[PDB]
Every structure is written in C-alpha cells, then in structure tokens.
Write a protein that binds this ligand. Sequence first.
Ligand SMILES: Nc1ncnc2c1ncn2[C@@H]1O[C@H](COP(=O)(O)OP(=O)(O)O)[C@@H](O)[C@H]1O
Ligand SMILES: [Mg+2]
Ligand SMILES: [Zn+2]
Lengths: 230, 196
Amino acid sequence: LKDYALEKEKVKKFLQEFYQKQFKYGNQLVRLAHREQVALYVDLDDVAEDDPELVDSICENARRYAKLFADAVQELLPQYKEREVVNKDVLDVYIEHRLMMEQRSRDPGMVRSPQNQYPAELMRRFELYFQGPSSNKPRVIREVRADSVGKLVTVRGIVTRVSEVKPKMVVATYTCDQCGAETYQPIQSPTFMPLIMCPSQECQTNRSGGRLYLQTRGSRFIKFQEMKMQ
Amino acid sequence: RIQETQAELPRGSIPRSLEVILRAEAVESAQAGDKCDFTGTLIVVPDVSKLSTPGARAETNSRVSGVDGYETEGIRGLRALGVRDLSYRLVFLACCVAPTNPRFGGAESIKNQMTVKEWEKVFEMSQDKNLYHNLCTSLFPTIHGNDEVKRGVLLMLFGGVPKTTGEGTSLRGDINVCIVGDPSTAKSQFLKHVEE
Ligand SMILES: Nc1ncnc2c1ncn2[C@@H]1O[C@H](COP(=O)(O)OP(=O)(O)O)[C@@H](O)[C@H]1O
Ligand SMILES: [Mg+2]
Ligand SMILES: [Zn+2]
C-alpha cells in the first residue's frame, strides 16, 4: 500500500539518474527511442545501489512494478528521442500512423472517455524485464510455493523441453464495417472471446450494427515460447 | 464410400475417397468391391466443427445492436445474430450406377441375359474340343511349360460343387492350390495372372 504515482516518479528518477559515469539506462533509453533495442533489462543490484527498499517492494510485488516500469519508460521515451525512427517494421508504421491521426483529430482541450484511447501496450515496441538481485538466494522448485506467488523468484534448473516460437496475441485489433474506426481488445487471459459489435461513438449514435471484424494485420503479437524446467 | 480407381492414381498419392449418396431405386445396386461408373451431380452437404480455426460464417444482415444487460456479445451475441460456420464437403450424388466394365448388354436366367452373339460364342466354346489346352494358352500366353500349374489354376477358377450333409456338415467345394518352388519360377506371376 504505497502511492504508486510517487513510486513512478522514483523509478523515473532511477532510470534518469543512474550511471556507472556513462548513464547505462540513459543510453539504453536513447537506443529505445531510436528502436535499435526491443527489450530493456533492469538490474535490481543497480536499483539497490541507491534504493534497496525499492528492490524489496519490487520483489514482494513484481508484476505491478513490471507494469509501472513499462509505463514510466513509455512516458520517458520522447524526452530522450533525438531523430525520427526509420520505420523499420510494419508495426512501427502502424504506431506512427495512429499517432499521426490521433494528433490530427485530437482537439487538445477536449476530454475523452478512458476507453477512447490506444491500449497502453499497443504503442510500446519495447519490453522491460528485471535481472534479479544478487542478494536473493536462488530457490529450489520444491521450495517455491504459494507464498512466492506474484514475487520475483530466482531459480536454477535444467531445461527439459521447449516449444517453438509461436505468435501470441497481446492486443487484438478490429475494424468496423460502418464507422471506419479501429477497435482494440487487450489480452490477459490465456484465451479470449472475440468481440462482435462496435463500441465506436459513430456506430452507437447512428444505431447501426458495426459488427467489427478481427484483423490479424493491425493487431499486436509478441513471440511466445514455453519451456519445462526442472 | 468409393475411392479412386488404381489406374488414375497420381505419383505418391493415397487413393482419395469420397462418399456417394444413392437415393431411391438406385440404392442397393452398388456393392462392396465392384468397379462401378456413377453419374449424377456433385453436391455439397453442410459440415460443422470440421476445423479448429474460424472460417466462413453466415449471419443475418439486420443491423440490430444490444441493450445494456443483454448486450449481443459472446454466446448470447452469436445466438442472437444466428452465427453459424459454413464448412462443406464434396459428396457425390449418384443419379445412376452401372458396372464400369459391363459383362453383358442386358443357368437359364443368365442364358436369357446372353445376347445372341455371345450365346453362340460360348456354345461353340463348349462344343470345342482341345478347349482344355486352349484355355491354358489364353489364360497364360506369357508362360512356357508349367502345364501342371496351368491346369490346376484353370480348374481352380472353375471350382468344384459345394455340398452339405443331412446332419449339417458343410462339405467343401472350392479347391485350394499351392505353388511352391525355387525362386523366380513364375509363382507370383501365376497369382498376378489370376488377379488381373
Ligand atoms: N517359365 C517361365 N515362363 C515365363 N516367365 C518366367 C518363367 N520363369 C520365370 N519367369 C519370369 O520370372 C519373373 C519373376 O518370377 P516370379 O514368379 O515373380 O518369382 P517369385 O516366384 O520368386 O515371385 C517373371 O516376371 C517371369 O517373367
Ligand atoms: Mg514372388
Ligand atoms: Zn464502428
């Protein structure tokens, strides 16, 4: 029970202010902004070098802080961005086009509903992960039990099996047959049900169907693998 | 259920098989093992749950939406719109069925079925003497020698008369033949001749 906005400002402080003097995370942020790097690896030893109690909070509550770190770095990218990305990937072209059209029709003073927004993971194009603290002792798969749920464990074992990289949905995208507005459905469950009707303002106002169709093209996927360690 | 004739196979291909529906009066005419020509439509019979991937689906074109608390989403939504996959499968609809290699253009019944030309042909065949060696030669023009095998296999094709006792013992009528010999002595060749 801590003020997550306060902790968000603190993780911003750590990301901006850390050095070793070369600003490790600053340079990684520049590389992120240029899209020369698709995943960032935070080092909890580096976190604890200044704020060990922050590392304590992360370890006792990891996934929350995965989300908070991701959001903070998303917010911090434009500060370090120097030059326009070269639009390497079709996904990057999609995010650039969506940013273009939302800035076009923004009406900057105007206020919009929370759901009339781009899902926060749809625009990232960077992953954030943790490298566990050396202070933590590597556990054993029998010992890791219910009291470790939601916590950042460190474990060692032999990888006995792994599936091949399959694409996994993270934000399904849909298009109406009426209003010409994309729709987005985030994903948290292993499975999901796909939408049918359109929640776009124009479709609801005109009281037309707007039976949106799922698009594999404008959606986001992430590489997905599963391994059985022991 | 019918499958591709052995002549029409492509290279490395399993014989495809498709299901043929036989409506009234053309119904018991086909039988298992025959070589039948079929004539009729190619229709499509609806299939459902043939694939684990979503495919083509029908739905009404009415522009209804869903009120709050009854919103046309999920299972309620699909039932309301009447969504249904359209997965089909070819199923031939045989209008008629004939043998692909008919025996006749149609003992007394078969004799009536005989045309005049074939009847006189088999008549002079029966009246022929040396029909023994003639049948040997006709069955096995390729073979040389092996006259005993020729004779035995011919008699096998004609067969004996099955009989049965008053008590109920089924006296055999068929006559089984065995060819045993050194390798490459036309044994499998004789069997192939009988097959073909
Ligand atoms: N007496 C024969 N007359 C004609 N062909 C023969 C004779 N003996 C052997 N052959 C030839 O030998 C080949 C193989 O004989 P086959 O019966 O297949 O051997 P196996 O009995 O081991 O299967 C045949 O294709 C056939 O042409
Ligand atoms: Mg053989
Ligand atoms: Zn719409």
